[PDB]
From Swiss-Prot, chain A:
Coiled coil: none annotated. This is ATP synthase subunit b', chloroplastic. In plastids the F-type ATPase is also known as CF(1)CF(0). It is found in: Plastid, Chloroplast thylakoid membrane. The gene is ATPF2. Belongs to the ATPase B chain family.
Curated annotation (Swiss-Prot), chain B:
F(1)F(0) ATP synthase produces ATP from ADP in the presence of a proton or sodium gradient. F-type ATPases consist of two structural domains, F(1) containing the extramembraneous catalytic core and F(0) containing the membrane proton channel, linked together by a central stalk and a peripheral stalk. During catalysis, ATP synthesis in the catalytic domain of F(1) is coupled via a rotary mechanism of the central stalk subunits to proton translocation. Component of the F(0) channel, it forms part of the peripheral stalk, linking F(1) to F(0). F-type ATPases have 2 components, F(1) - the catalytic core - and F(0) - the membrane proton channel. F(1) has five subunits: alpha(3), beta(3), gamma(1), delta(1), epsilon(1). F(0) has four main subunits: a(1), b(1), b'(1) and c(10-14). The alpha and beta chains form an alternating ring which encloses part of the gamma chain. F(1) is attached to F(0) by a central stalk formed by the gamma and epsilon chains, while a peripheral stalk is formed by the delta, b and b' chains. The gene is atpF. Its main location: plastid. This is ATP synthase subunit b, chloroplastic. Keywords: ATP synthesis, ATP-binding, CF(0), Chloroplast, Hydrogen ion transport, Ion transport, Membrane, Nucleotide-binding, Plastid, Thylakoid, Transmembrane, Transmembrane helix, Transport. It comes from Spinacia oleracea. The chain holds residues 63 to 123 of 184 of the full protein.
């Protein structure tokens, strides 16, 4: 019975941690996506400027 | 307690993945923007030269 109690409690605590783990993983995913999108935009802008300046 | 961690992890990953997906898309917009800008700069350079050649010819006139 002691083992059963432990198993159930661990299963629940583990579920909470995983749920906590998943939330952090999704926050990281969102941050990475945001950073990547910024790079695209900024990168291209810089490119044109440098390219625009060279053309000029 | 269990329902919380899972939600955090679910929501969290939905968000990291989403953020990086947005990064990719931008990586796309910028990529697009860079091409457009490059083409515009070439055309603008073309503008200058063409018009100044016109100005030359008018000077010759």
């Amino acid at each position: 019975l002691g083992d059963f109690m432990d198993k159930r409690d661990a299963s629940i605590k583990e579920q909470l941690s995983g749920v906590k783990d998943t939330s952090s993983e999704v926050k990281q995913l969102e941050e990475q996506a945001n950073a990547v999108m910024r790079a695209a935009r900024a990168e291209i802008s810089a490119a044109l400027n440098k390219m625009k300046k060279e053309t000029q | 307690t269990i329902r919380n961690s899972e939600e955090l992890r679910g929501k969290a990953i939905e968000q990291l993945e989403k953020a990086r997906a947005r990064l990719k898309k931008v990586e796309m917009d910028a990529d697009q923007f860079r091409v457009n800008g490059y083409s515009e700069i070439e055309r603008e350079k073309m503008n200058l030269i063409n018009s100044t050649y016109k100005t030359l010819e008018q000077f010759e006139n």
